[PDB]
Amino acid sequence: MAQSTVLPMHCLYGIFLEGNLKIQKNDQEGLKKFKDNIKKFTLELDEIDKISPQSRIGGAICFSSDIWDTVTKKISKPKELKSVNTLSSYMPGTSQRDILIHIISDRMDTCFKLAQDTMRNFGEDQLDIKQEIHGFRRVEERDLTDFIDGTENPDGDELRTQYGLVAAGQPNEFGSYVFTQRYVHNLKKWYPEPLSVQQDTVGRTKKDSIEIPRDKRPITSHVSRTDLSENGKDLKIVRQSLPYGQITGEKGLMFIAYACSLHNIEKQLQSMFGQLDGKHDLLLKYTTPVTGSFYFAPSKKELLEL
Amino acid sequence: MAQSTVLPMHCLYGIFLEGNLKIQKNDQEGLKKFKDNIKKFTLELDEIDKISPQSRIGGAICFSSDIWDTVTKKISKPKELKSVNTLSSYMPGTSQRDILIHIISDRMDTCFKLAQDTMRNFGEDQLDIKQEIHGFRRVEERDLTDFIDGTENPDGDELRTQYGLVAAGQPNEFGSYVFTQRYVHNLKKWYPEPLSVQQDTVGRTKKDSIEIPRDKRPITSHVSRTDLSENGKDLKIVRQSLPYGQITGEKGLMFIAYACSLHNIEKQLQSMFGQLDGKHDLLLKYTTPVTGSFYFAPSKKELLEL
Ligand code: HEM
Ligand code: HEM
Ligand SMILES: [Zn+2]
Ligand SMILES: [Zn+2]
């Protein structure tokens, strides 16, 4: 019942299209056309899944709090949804956009086909795309830091439903809060660091990705910053982050997280960026966030009922 | 015996690294290091092929006429090799570089691994990369014009050896002349054209890629421009071109051709760009070349004997 970018694991390609809606709330013709294009997206997702099962195609269209009142007068706004720009006083790179199209695949050709077709359907008259990122998995699922990324990512449908999707019976059930954040890696600063420093920075071993016991890693290690609980509940999120960029140019990590609660994501941003104890994540000495947005991906039913 | 980017067909990904050699001919230490890095490339190619047969990994390192005398004092220069800048008086976009690293794969992760490892081995002290392109095949092997690309590409080991590789018994046998040319498509001009105009431009039907009989297509159609013979011999080339670019930005075709003779390629450039009859290829109304280089990919043996 959820849009298909949360529960599936280990995608090899991901295309990220972030931009603003150019249609106004009272433009009924434009709004009708816009929602016909949403329908076309859901249909083409199904079509590609049928002719290319090997692609394990997935796709979601997601919306910001700013735009919610424009795309629907029927579906209540998700209660936690807000602009990420409200974090600008302590987190750099914020750039809230109205719309996210996130498409995942095990093949670039079907990933690109769905992305290109969808953008051609919407057109420049409906979407002003501010950011288009072609993400791709690397050997051994390693981030460009050459650490494995995804180890303690929730595993399986049950746990990814629990932490990734709004719980059944709640408003906007089976939707998902979404955070996107493009990082630019400063590998010239990272590569020369000795192994012990690099592992102190992350909190896990580089080769095998074995968790360094919390007692022995710095509280500013990445894992210490993000492996959080509250009142005995783990604040786990579902990450679909992928590497991107040029070998000889700008590269980094296209971070994206899906969560049952925006607060699960925001608490980790507050931890990483000093807002809980006044200390920043050690990883941020080697990588910089340059974009950022909060969205909500409706369930498949509410997406079509907007 | 040839480097592995000519004979294999239907690659799904291709990474193109074009740049200049920063090591001088008398720098014996730098030259030794540079050739150790070539050896590492050939070895890593074999290693990846062994652990990932599904990738059908391929790779070639190629050299310009300008740099030939710098990388080897033993292997005679290929007799046709010259700078592509000598065509600048009639072909735009020329940008001759010393070195091409072309890597192909059916998986981006192994394609990127070999490309990144290789560039890290060479380093900025040995290569000044002017252009890095991530090519990828699209559904139905279609160019961004949405015409199928590759139909009359020579098919099979025998014909691709004949037209793609220097003939056995000749100097530099089993090497290959290489032409690279990045095109930027002007699809805003292309999309609105009626089907008959688009097919007149190419010379084949859009859906099925059926050749329009030469009698009925314009002499400036793309096929009429490039389907050439001389003294009864077809001047066929082996193309490994791939689409590239951003849906919402700059995109086009990363053209690359391998040939037994540079003249097979150059005659087609002369035809397309008006130097044979004073008429240009109709396709050039919708796409522009912005880079260009001639190289020669040595055989695997001569590559290691430089
Ligand atoms: C350049 C940016 C980032 C890089 C390179 C990076 C890298 C990594 C790596 C290598 C791990 C190893 C452990 C694992 O994947 O389970 C990890 C874990 C994790 N990351 Fe990040 N990450 C980045 C940004 C973020 C952000 C912005 C967040 C949250 C907003 C986040 C949340 C997490 C979480 C929750 C874990 C698992 C913690 C646990 O439960 O053990 N990451 N990350
Ligand atoms: C934007 C640039 C280009 C585009 C979009 C393009 C597209 C195409 C298409 C759609 C075909 C269909 C037939 C087939 O693939 O067999 C084709 C054929 C061909 N192209 Fe191009 N091409 C481009 C540039 C070039 C260049 C620069 C050359 C030579 C230097 C070239 C040489 C050929 C040849 C030899 C054929 C096959 C001709 C035959 O024997 O029938 N192409 N091209
Ligand atoms: Zn809390
Ligand atoms: Zn001739």
XYZ file of C-alpha atoms and ligand atoms in Angstrom:
700
model
C 0.000 0.000 0.000
C 3.073 2.216 0.303
C 4.857 3.766 -2.636
C 7.648 1.440 -3.651
C 10.874 3.172 -2.515
C 10.857 2.227 1.194
C 10.620 -1.529 1.712
C 12.832 -2.834 -1.152
C 16.535 -3.197 -0.382
C 19.868 -3.073 -2.204
C 18.878 -1.003 -5.241
C 21.745 -0.591 -7.705
C 20.586 2.704 -9.251
C 18.591 5.666 -8.039
C 17.469 8.843 -9.794
C 16.541 11.831 -7.619
C 14.478 14.685 -9.091
C 13.834 17.562 -6.675
C 12.074 20.741 -7.698
C 9.139 23.069 -7.243
C 5.544 22.825 -8.411
C 4.774 25.530 -10.971
C 0.976 25.031 -10.884
C -1.132 27.238 -8.609
C -3.870 25.919 -6.322
C -6.723 27.624 -8.197
C -5.505 26.452 -11.640
C -7.962 23.582 -11.956
C -6.900 22.673 -15.503
C -3.214 22.597 -14.592
C -3.984 20.675 -11.408
C -6.031 18.090 -13.318
C -3.183 17.690 -15.810
C -0.681 17.400 -12.955
C -2.690 14.618 -11.305
C -3.146 12.818 -14.626
C 0.653 12.806 -14.793
C 0.810 11.278 -11.304
C -1.542 8.529 -12.488
C 0.673 7.980 -15.539
C 3.661 7.578 -13.217
C 1.978 4.910 -11.096
C 0.893 3.092 -14.263
C 4.314 3.218 -15.912
C 5.838 1.906 -12.675
C 3.550 -1.129 -12.915
C 4.234 -1.540 -16.639
C 8.020 -1.506 -16.251
C 7.810 -3.892 -13.235
C 5.868 -6.316 -15.502
C 8.168 -6.286 -18.540
C 11.408 -6.006 -16.510
C 11.072 -7.926 -13.234
C 14.875 -7.982 -13.013
C 14.885 -4.198 -12.554
C 12.974 -4.391 -9.251
C 11.742 -0.950 -10.216
C 10.528 1.336 -7.453
C 9.221 4.870 -7.436
C 7.710 7.543 -5.237
C 6.365 11.060 -5.669
C 6.640 13.075 -2.455
C 5.424 16.477 -1.297
C 6.545 19.231 1.058
C 4.457 20.978 3.698
C 4.594 24.200 1.662
C 2.875 22.556 -1.322
C 0.490 20.182 0.479
C -2.426 22.639 0.451
C -1.912 23.158 -3.295
C -2.024 19.543 -4.501
C -4.948 18.379 -2.341
C -7.992 19.800 -0.585
C -9.050 16.322 0.628
C -6.086 14.604 2.321
C -5.104 16.061 5.685
C -1.540 17.310 5.946
C 0.842 14.930 7.765
C 1.077 16.234 11.298
C 4.887 16.419 11.518
C 5.569 17.722 8.010
C 7.415 21.050 7.850
C 10.063 22.799 5.777
C 13.656 21.732 6.333
C 14.620 25.410 6.065
C 13.567 25.743 9.725
C 16.859 23.955 10.531
C 18.993 26.506 8.674
C 20.136 28.195 11.902
C 22.311 25.151 12.669
C 22.390 22.852 9.606
C 23.941 24.151 6.359
C 22.770 23.259 2.884
C 19.019 23.521 3.447
C 17.075 24.042 0.154
C 13.432 22.975 0.689
C 11.676 21.974 -2.542
C 8.019 21.192 -3.214
C 8.397 17.849 -4.997
C 10.604 14.759 -4.923
C 10.543 12.071 -7.589
C 12.679 9.174 -6.360
C 13.090 6.168 -8.657
C 15.144 3.057 -7.916
C 16.164 0.106 -10.062
C 18.694 -2.662 -10.557
C 19.147 -1.410 -14.152
C 19.926 2.139 -15.236
C 17.985 1.841 -18.496
C 14.615 1.286 -16.804
C 15.499 3.762 -14.044
C 16.220 6.412 -16.685
C 13.219 5.476 -18.835
C 10.764 6.037 -15.993
C 12.501 9.244 -14.890
C 12.686 10.703 -18.405
C 9.150 9.711 -19.402
C 7.809 11.170 -16.158
C 9.618 14.486 -16.559
C 8.480 14.699 -20.183
C 4.887 14.135 -19.043
C 5.138 16.832 -16.368
C 7.166 19.263 -18.469
C 8.763 22.570 -17.568
C 5.255 24.045 -17.263
C 4.593 21.928 -14.145
C 7.976 21.197 -12.504
C 11.053 23.382 -12.052
C 13.698 20.768 -11.294
C 16.437 22.249 -9.108
C 18.417 19.023 -8.677
C 18.795 15.829 -10.710
C 21.129 13.185 -9.272
C 22.039 9.820 -10.803
C 22.944 7.579 -7.885
C 24.566 4.182 -8.300
C 25.665 1.452 -5.919
C 29.381 0.694 -5.707
C 31.125 -2.633 -5.230
C 30.475 -4.071 -1.757
C 27.804 -1.380 -1.179
C 30.565 0.989 -0.033
C 30.277 4.751 0.308
C 33.004 6.800 -1.370
C 34.712 6.870 2.026
C 35.178 3.143 1.198
C 33.226 2.158 4.298
C 30.273 -0.163 3.800
C 27.006 1.787 3.945
C 23.823 0.026 5.039
C 24.931 -2.437 7.712
C 22.459 -1.523 10.486
C 19.827 -0.312 7.998
C 16.585 -2.055 9.083
C 16.376 -5.416 7.321
C 13.204 -7.008 5.982
C 9.609 -6.016 5.315
C 8.531 -6.087 8.968
C 11.225 -3.812 10.404
C 11.243 -1.492 7.382
C 7.467 -1.194 7.710
C 7.767 -0.461 11.441
C 10.458 2.207 11.106
C 9.825 3.341 7.530
C 6.059 3.748 7.234
C 3.326 5.527 9.159
C 1.648 2.868 11.287
C -1.636 1.342 10.164
C -4.729 2.950 11.654
C -3.100 6.397 11.870
C -3.800 9.335 9.549
C -1.840 9.037 6.295
C -1.132 5.391 7.139
C 1.484 3.715 4.903
C 2.930 7.036 3.787
C 6.445 7.991 4.780
C 8.368 11.056 5.901
C 11.334 11.704 3.608
C 14.600 13.596 4.064
C 17.007 14.211 1.170
C 20.487 15.674 1.578
C 23.258 15.741 -1.029
C 26.770 15.526 0.416
C 29.977 16.612 -1.331
C 32.906 14.520 -0.108
C 36.308 16.095 0.548
C 38.300 12.932 -0.129
C 41.612 14.802 -0.431
C 41.208 15.387 3.315
C 39.887 11.868 3.983
C 42.279 9.596 2.079
C 45.465 10.596 4.004
C 43.962 9.910 7.442
C 45.273 6.738 9.130
C 42.914 3.794 9.464
C 42.423 4.349 13.203
C 41.293 7.937 12.596
C 38.917 6.907 9.805
C 37.348 4.207 11.982
C 37.149 6.568 14.957
C 35.235 8.887 12.616
C 32.658 6.278 11.553
C 32.441 3.935 14.530
C 32.924 0.673 12.604
C 35.804 -1.229 11.055
C 36.539 -0.389 7.431
C 37.014 -3.906 6.037
C 34.160 -5.866 7.635
C 31.968 -3.042 9.028
C 32.030 -4.497 12.541
C 30.553 -2.100 15.089
C 33.188 -0.695 17.431
C 31.669 -0.998 20.938
C 30.059 2.288 21.952
C 32.268 2.276 25.056
C 35.404 2.481 22.889
C 34.388 4.882 20.098
C 34.056 8.674 20.451
C 30.611 10.066 21.210
C 31.107 12.117 18.027
C 31.669 9.022 15.873
C 29.022 8.780 13.163
C 27.359 5.725 14.719
C 27.245 7.357 18.158
C 25.661 10.419 16.544
C 22.975 8.527 14.615
C 22.325 5.313 16.615
C 19.814 6.965 18.929
C 16.943 5.829 21.114
C 14.239 7.689 23.017
C 12.233 6.280 25.930
C 13.558 2.834 25.041
C 12.532 2.995 21.364
C 15.222 2.973 18.686
C 14.845 5.964 16.356
C 15.613 3.839 13.314
C 15.159 5.101 9.754
C 15.206 3.456 6.325
C 18.049 4.823 4.191
C 18.174 4.506 0.399
C 21.325 6.610 0.054
C 23.552 6.075 -2.985
C 26.954 7.344 -4.134
C 27.050 9.801 -7.019
C 29.426 11.990 -8.958
C 32.565 12.212 -11.059
C 35.810 10.401 -10.318
C 37.754 13.500 -11.401
C 35.240 16.048 -10.060
C 32.492 16.566 -7.517
C 31.299 13.405 -5.795
C 29.753 12.279 -2.546
C 26.655 10.633 -1.091
C 23.066 11.347 -2.103
C 21.480 10.764 1.291
C 17.804 9.861 1.532
C 15.918 8.467 4.523
C 12.345 7.247 4.892
C 10.730 7.128 8.329
C 7.460 6.491 10.134
C 8.065 9.809 11.943
C 9.905 12.925 10.796
C 11.154 13.208 14.379
C 13.206 10.020 13.947
C 15.154 11.813 11.209
C 15.232 15.262 12.799
C 16.609 14.008 16.115
C 19.558 12.514 14.224
C 20.161 15.788 12.391
C 20.075 17.593 15.737
C 22.635 15.118 17.085
C 24.966 15.263 14.076
C 24.865 19.071 13.877
C 25.502 19.928 17.518
C 21.988 20.859 18.645
C 21.798 18.239 21.444
C 25.208 18.451 23.157
C 27.161 21.118 21.253
C 29.377 18.642 19.387
C 29.298 17.912 15.659
C 29.629 14.587 13.853
C 33.277 13.791 13.099
C 32.264 12.745 9.589
C 31.398 16.379 8.820
C 35.113 17.219 8.795
C 35.302 15.328 5.473
C 31.915 15.923 3.810
C 29.528 18.862 3.455
C 25.737 18.957 2.911
C 24.784 21.254 0.026
C 21.045 20.519 -0.373
C 18.223 19.461 1.908
C 14.474 18.858 1.920
C 11.680 17.284 3.949
C 8.829 15.572 2.105
C 6.032 13.089 2.759
C 5.417 10.212 0.358
C 1.695 9.365 0.543
C 0.498 5.804 0.418
C -0.398 4.571 -3.048
C -4.084 5.176 -2.292
C -3.741 8.715 -0.936
C -1.356 9.573 -3.787
C -4.168 8.894 -6.265
C -6.834 10.554 -4.079
C -5.106 13.938 -3.723
C 45.100 -10.055 -28.577
C 43.267 -6.738 -28.869
C 42.312 -4.586 -25.924
C 38.795 -5.501 -24.915
C 36.618 -2.554 -26.042
C 36.233 -3.403 -29.754
C 34.844 -6.899 -30.286
C 32.285 -7.144 -27.425
C 28.782 -5.889 -28.193
C 25.819 -4.361 -26.368
C 27.596 -2.923 -23.324
C 25.177 -1.335 -20.856
C 27.630 1.144 -19.299
C 30.700 2.976 -20.502
C 33.069 5.363 -18.736
C 35.185 7.677 -20.902
C 38.269 9.371 -19.421
C 40.081 11.707 -21.828
C 43.029 13.827 -20.794
C 46.677 14.681 -21.243
C 49.823 12.922 -20.078
C 51.672 15.029 -17.510
C 54.893 12.957 -17.601
C 57.743 14.062 -19.870
C 59.659 11.708 -22.164
C 62.964 12.026 -20.285
C 61.360 11.473 -16.845
C 62.357 7.828 -16.542
C 61.006 7.446 -12.998
C 57.640 8.955 -13.906
C 57.519 6.899 -17.097
C 58.264 3.681 -15.198
C 55.517 4.525 -12.705
C 53.133 5.341 -15.559
C 53.763 1.974 -17.221
C 53.404 0.140 -13.907
C 49.964 1.750 -13.737
C 49.172 0.448 -17.231
C 50.125 -3.046 -16.060
C 47.885 -2.608 -13.008
C 45.013 -1.688 -15.329
C 45.398 -4.811 -17.461
C 45.600 -6.930 -14.302
C 42.559 -5.361 -12.650
C 40.623 -5.885 -15.891
C 41.397 -9.607 -15.663
C 40.600 -9.701 -11.940
C 37.191 -8.053 -12.325
C 36.365 -10.289 -15.350
C 37.084 -13.318 -13.093
C 35.015 -12.321 -10.053
C 32.206 -10.676 -12.080
C 31.693 -12.544 -15.363
C 28.230 -10.971 -15.581
C 29.836 -7.543 -16.026
C 31.485 -8.521 -19.331
C 34.068 -5.939 -18.354
C 36.144 -4.380 -21.111
C 38.834 -1.742 -21.116
C 41.343 0.038 -23.307
C 44.061 2.643 -22.863
C 44.674 4.594 -26.070
C 47.227 7.155 -27.216
C 47.391 10.133 -29.560
C 50.027 10.831 -32.196
C 51.277 13.795 -30.148
C 52.127 11.564 -27.171
C 53.272 8.406 -28.982
C 56.958 9.383 -28.948
C 56.711 10.058 -25.200
C 55.269 6.737 -24.007
C 57.418 4.444 -26.174
C 60.778 4.436 -27.927
C 60.251 0.844 -29.153
C 56.839 0.561 -30.850
C 56.576 2.310 -34.207
C 53.887 4.963 -34.461
C 50.718 3.834 -36.287
C 51.065 5.126 -39.815
C 47.699 6.920 -40.031
C 47.636 8.377 -36.518
C 47.387 12.174 -36.345
C 45.737 14.878 -34.263
C 42.033 15.449 -34.820
C 42.731 19.186 -34.538
C 43.828 19.051 -38.198
C 40.088 18.842 -39.007
C 39.246 22.053 -37.139
C 38.936 24.080 -40.360
C 35.671 22.259 -41.137
C 34.615 20.202 -38.082
C 33.764 22.027 -34.829
C 34.439 20.708 -31.358
C 37.944 19.346 -31.923
C 39.921 18.976 -28.630
C 42.761 16.457 -29.172
C 43.919 14.790 -25.945
C 46.892 12.520 -25.280
C 45.121 9.652 -23.508
C 41.806 7.800 -23.592
C 40.712 5.334 -20.936
C 37.545 3.630 -22.173
C 35.888 1.079 -19.887
C 32.703 -0.855 -20.638
C 30.519 -3.096 -18.501
C 27.049 -4.521 -18.014
C 27.171 -3.208 -14.414
C 27.981 0.330 -13.317
C 29.607 -0.780 -10.060
C 32.418 -2.714 -11.757
C 32.678 -0.088 -14.507
C 33.155 2.606 -11.856
C 35.468 0.471 -9.712
C 37.930 -0.059 -12.554
C 37.728 3.586 -13.643
C 38.181 4.972 -10.123
C 40.955 2.562 -9.133
C 42.793 3.320 -12.372
C 42.573 7.090 -11.958
C 43.689 6.784 -8.334
C 46.699 4.744 -9.479
C 47.625 7.300 -12.144
C 46.827 10.356 -10.032
C 46.796 14.032 -10.920
C 50.598 13.869 -11.222
C 50.295 11.683 -14.349
C 46.926 12.473 -15.989
C 45.076 15.764 -16.431
C 41.569 14.532 -17.196
C 39.725 17.048 -19.375
C 36.558 14.977 -19.816
C 34.852 12.243 -17.794
C 31.613 10.854 -19.240
C 29.353 8.193 -17.720
C 27.580 6.564 -20.646
C 24.663 4.183 -20.242
C 22.506 2.192 -22.632
C 18.821 3.093 -22.844
C 15.825 0.831 -23.331
C 15.802 -0.735 -26.810
C 19.366 0.562 -27.380
C 17.881 3.887 -28.515
C 19.748 7.167 -28.843
C 18.155 10.177 -27.156
C 16.643 10.983 -30.550
C 14.631 7.808 -29.735
C 15.977 6.095 -32.840
C 17.657 2.734 -32.353
C 21.444 3.103 -32.494
C 23.572 0.156 -33.596
C 21.521 -1.588 -36.277
C 24.148 -1.807 -39.051
C 27.043 -1.845 -36.560
C 29.232 -4.801 -37.654
C 27.985 -7.936 -35.905
C 30.173 -10.734 -34.573
C 33.846 -11.375 -33.906
C 34.793 -11.885 -37.560
C 33.330 -8.673 -38.986
C 34.302 -6.579 -35.955
C 37.844 -7.919 -36.285
C 37.888 -7.116 -40.013
C 36.594 -3.556 -39.667
C 37.647 -2.813 -36.086
C 41.226 -4.054 -35.792
C 44.459 -3.604 -37.714
C 44.842 -6.718 -39.852
C 47.160 -9.504 -38.738
C 50.645 -9.364 -40.224
C 50.644 -5.551 -40.426
C 52.529 -3.202 -38.095
C 50.626 -2.646 -34.841
C 48.431 -5.638 -35.697
C 45.348 -6.045 -33.465
C 45.457 -2.428 -32.336
C 42.686 -0.060 -33.323
C 42.256 3.536 -34.431
C 39.849 5.380 -32.133
C 37.704 8.487 -32.580
C 35.787 10.059 -29.682
C 33.265 12.870 -30.081
C 30.786 14.104 -27.472
C 27.519 15.413 -28.915
C 25.081 17.758 -27.161
C 21.541 17.122 -28.390
C 19.137 20.001 -29.037
C 15.985 17.988 -28.369
C 13.788 21.091 -28.059
C 14.406 21.462 -31.802
C 14.099 17.719 -32.484
C 10.964 16.678 -30.587
C 8.511 18.949 -32.506
C 9.581 17.699 -35.947
C 7.043 15.397 -37.645
C 7.920 11.729 -37.992
C 8.603 12.035 -41.730
C 11.156 14.794 -41.111
C 12.863 12.838 -38.325
C 13.131 9.735 -40.514
C 14.321 11.796 -43.480
C 17.040 13.067 -41.132
C 18.256 9.604 -40.080
C 17.455 7.404 -43.066
C 15.624 4.654 -41.152
C 12.206 4.158 -39.607
C 11.897 5.217 -35.980
C 9.965 2.235 -34.598
C 11.710 -0.750 -36.205
C 14.899 0.873 -37.590
C 14.225 -0.404 -41.108
C 16.586 1.143 -43.649
C 14.805 3.546 -45.983
C 16.052 2.637 -49.493
C 18.912 4.925 -50.496
C 16.911 5.868 -53.598
C 14.161 7.384 -51.428
C 16.103 9.111 -48.630
C 18.021 12.401 -48.969
C 21.732 12.191 -49.726
C 22.157 14.246 -46.535
C 20.325 11.680 -44.392
C 22.613 10.321 -41.685
C 22.814 6.855 -43.253
C 23.617 8.294 -46.686
C 26.355 10.380 -45.062
C 27.975 7.516 -43.143
C 27.192 4.340 -45.154
C 30.170 4.770 -47.464
C 32.283 2.525 -49.656
C 35.524 3.059 -51.554
C 36.739 0.940 -54.474
C 34.069 -1.615 -53.596
C 35.063 -1.920 -49.920
C 32.618 -0.801 -47.240
C 34.234 1.734 -44.899
C 32.630 0.129 -41.865
C 33.576 1.064 -38.300
C 32.829 -0.416 -34.877
C 30.840 2.026 -32.735
C 30.588 1.779 -28.945
C 28.637 5.026 -28.590
C 26.393 5.481 -25.551
C 23.857 8.077 -24.395
C 24.816 10.329 -21.500
C 23.601 13.316 -19.552
C 20.855 14.849 -17.447
C 17.148 14.600 -18.192
C 16.712 18.228 -17.096
C 20.074 19.463 -18.430
C 22.783 18.768 -20.974
C 22.513 15.406 -22.708
C 23.433 13.740 -25.962
C 25.533 10.935 -27.426
C 29.083 10.044 -26.415
C 30.271 8.852 -29.812
C 33.209 6.467 -30.059
C 34.323 4.413 -33.056
C 37.033 1.786 -33.433
C 38.446 1.001 -36.872
C 41.133 -0.964 -38.681
C 42.003 2.301 -40.478
C 41.669 5.900 -39.318
C 40.663 6.702 -42.899
C 37.445 4.694 -42.477
C 36.448 7.137 -39.731
C 37.851 10.294 -41.308
C 36.073 9.761 -44.627
C 32.766 9.661 -42.739
C 33.618 12.873 -40.894
C 34.469 14.480 -44.234
C 31.098 13.340 -45.589
C 29.049 14.455 -42.577
C 30.766 17.855 -42.365
C 30.559 18.915 -46.002
C 34.134 18.261 -47.129
C 33.191 15.821 -49.937
C 30.199 17.474 -51.647
C 29.570 20.713 -49.731
C 26.507 19.413 -47.873
C 26.264 18.706 -44.147
C 24.544 15.833 -42.353
C 20.905 16.668 -41.599
C 21.371 15.277 -38.094
C 23.705 18.191 -37.312
C 20.705 20.537 -37.281
C 19.723 18.895 -33.965
C 23.039 17.982 -32.304
C 26.452 19.619 -31.940
C 29.920 18.085 -31.399
C 31.761 19.745 -28.506
C 34.827 17.482 -28.112
C 36.929 15.329 -30.400
C 40.062 13.184 -30.417
C 41.919 10.575 -32.454
C 43.765 7.802 -30.619
C 45.234 4.366 -31.284
C 44.561 1.493 -28.893
C 47.565 -0.861 -29.085
C 47.127 -4.592 -28.973
C 47.408 -6.103 -25.513
C 51.001 -7.127 -26.270
C 52.202 -3.775 -27.613
C 50.409 -1.991 -24.756
C 52.660 -3.815 -22.283
C 55.782 -3.444 -24.465
C 55.664 0.356 -24.808
C 28.166 11.924 3.820
C 27.099 11.580 4.551
C 26.989 10.201 5.241
C 27.824 9.155 5.137
C 29.116 9.046 4.292
C 27.303 8.093 5.969
C 27.869 6.850 6.138
C 27.426 5.868 6.994
C 28.074 4.599 7.225
C 29.376 4.117 6.550
C 27.361 3.909 8.117
C 27.798 2.497 8.569
C 26.791 1.744 9.422
C 25.533 1.383 8.678
O 25.350 1.771 7.495
O 24.691 0.697 9.304
C 26.213 4.726 8.500
C 25.204 4.424 9.397
C 24.108 5.202 9.711
N 23.840 6.475 9.246
Fe 25.074 7.571 8.007
N 26.143 8.540 6.566
C 25.916 9.835 6.147
C 24.854 10.635 6.527
C 23.833 10.296 7.398
C 22.731 11.144 7.817
C 22.520 12.601 7.348
C 21.963 10.440 8.664
C 20.665 10.855 9.399
C 20.009 11.980 9.103
C 22.543 9.125 8.801
C 22.040 8.106 9.584
C 22.642 6.887 9.801
C 22.143 5.817 10.644
C 20.835 5.821 11.465
C 23.017 4.811 10.585
C 22.886 3.472 11.342
C 23.163 3.732 12.822
C 22.956 2.483 13.637
O 21.787 2.188 14.002
O 23.961 1.788 13.935
N 23.680 9.073 8.019
N 26.299 5.912 7.791
C 24.723 12.765 -32.331
C 25.541 12.001 -33.064
C 25.052 10.709 -33.759
C 23.850 10.119 -33.658
C 22.635 10.569 -32.813
C 23.869 8.939 -34.495
C 22.826 8.058 -34.667
C 22.808 6.984 -35.527
C 21.681 6.114 -35.762
C 20.297 6.232 -35.088
C 22.032 5.189 -36.658
C 21.034 4.100 -37.114
C 21.625 2.992 -37.971
C 22.608 2.126 -37.229
O 22.937 2.394 -36.045
O 23.076 1.148 -37.858
C 23.419 5.438 -37.039
C 24.203 4.738 -37.937
C 25.527 4.975 -38.250
N 26.312 6.010 -37.780
Fe 25.664 7.523 -36.536
N 25.109 8.851 -35.090
C 25.867 9.924 -34.667
C 27.170 10.195 -35.045
C 27.948 9.456 -35.918
C 29.307 9.754 -36.335
C 30.120 10.980 -35.861
C 29.702 8.793 -37.185
C 31.053 8.616 -37.920
C 32.127 9.352 -37.620
C 28.616 7.851 -37.326
C 28.637 6.718 -38.114
C 27.573 5.874 -38.334
C 27.567 4.696 -39.181
C 28.753 4.144 -40.004
C 26.347 4.159 -39.126
C 25.895 2.895 -39.888
C 25.756 3.254 -41.366
C 25.411 2.038 -42.186
O 26.343 1.275 -42.554
O 24.206 1.840 -42.486
N 27.565 8.287 -36.544
N 23.848 6.545 -36.325
Zn 12.320 13.201 20.757
Zn 39.611 7.217 -49.275
